[PDB]
Ligand binder design. Structure first.
Ligand SMILES: CC(=O)Nc1ccc(OC[C@](C)(O)C(=O)Nc2ccc([N+](=O)[O-])c(C(F)(F)F)c2)cc1
Length: 247
């Protein structure tokens, strides 16, 4: 289980938002902490992605771009798993110090998106996603959104993605002799993985609008995150960069 030993070994630990929870909830503070949190997680997504088998093969420029494009989707997936294992989908476990109840979902003005992520969180339980299927699906998520104009070296990316899909195949085949059994499972996971994209899109849209009017709502965007949003998010929303759906 060399591949899975690696995925487990590099899985990031707990990341806290640094949110002041004894302060009454406000849009400005919740979002400022979500932005800070988002940034704190990116630091781990980068160290995590670079330690992934074969990731180093990608061209240095594709590595960064791929991490940036899939940044939202990867967080969504990991947050839903956290919400499932930690609180049973009762709330959204963004971080230990940033747990969202419906009231917070509403105040953040990302209610539609939150309810969708809560549903994703319930899927982990309904589908009985094992900790290993989770790890392999998350890795595959990093290789699921590319530029229509192509990466600097599109071929290496294609090979890499195909190998991650093959690993998922193995995890599914592990303890499933019936081919029909493996098929139904692949269908379910690929379907669950696609469902992450529409959520990421809505979150991307929300983040884009929020940045443009950041100054009017007193939200504080980290210097690094603002730059990445202004350069990368529009490519996604305008259709230049698109996610790879299975279905
Ligand atoms: C390409 C790009 O700019 N991506 C990107 C930019 C900003 C960004 O953060 C936006 C915001 C509003 O701070 C946010 O959604 N933060 C955030 C922080 C943590 C988590 N999380 O799961 O731990 C999430 C998530 F995934 F739930 F929506 C979202 C996320 C992705």
């Amino acid at each position: 289980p060399i591949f899975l030993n690696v995925l487990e070994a590099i899985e990031p630990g707990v990341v806290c938002a640094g949110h002041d929870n004894n302060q009454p909830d406000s849009f400005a503070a919740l979002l400022s902490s979500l932005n800070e949190l988002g940034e704190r997680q990116l630091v781990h997504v980068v160290k995590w992605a670079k330690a992934l088998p074969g990731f180093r093969n990608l061209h240095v420029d594709d590595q960064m771009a791929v991490i940036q494009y899939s940044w939202m989707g990867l967080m969504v997936f990991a947050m839903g798993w956290r919400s499932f294992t930690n609180v049973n989908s009762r709330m959204l476990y963004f971080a230990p110090d940033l747990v969202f109840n419906e009231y917070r979902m509403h105040k953040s003005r990302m209610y539609s998106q939150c309810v969708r992520m809560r549903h994703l969180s319930q899927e982990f339980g309904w589908l009985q996603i094992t900790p290993q299927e989770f790890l392999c699906m998350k890795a595959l998520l990093l290789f699921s959104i590319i530029p229509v104009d192509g990466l600097k070296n599109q071929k290496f990316f294609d090979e890499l993605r195909m190998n991650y899909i093959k690993e998922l195949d193995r995890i599914i085949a592990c303890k499933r002799k019936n081919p029909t059994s493996c098929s139904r499972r692949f269908y379910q996971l690929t379907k669950l993985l696609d469902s992450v994209q529409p959520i990421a899109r809505e979150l991307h849209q929300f983040t884009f609008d929020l940045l443009i009017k950041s100054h009017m709502v007193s939200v504080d965007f980290p210097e690094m995150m603002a730059e990445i949003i202004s350069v990368q998010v529009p490519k996604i929303l305008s259709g230049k960069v698109k996610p790879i759906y299975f279905h």
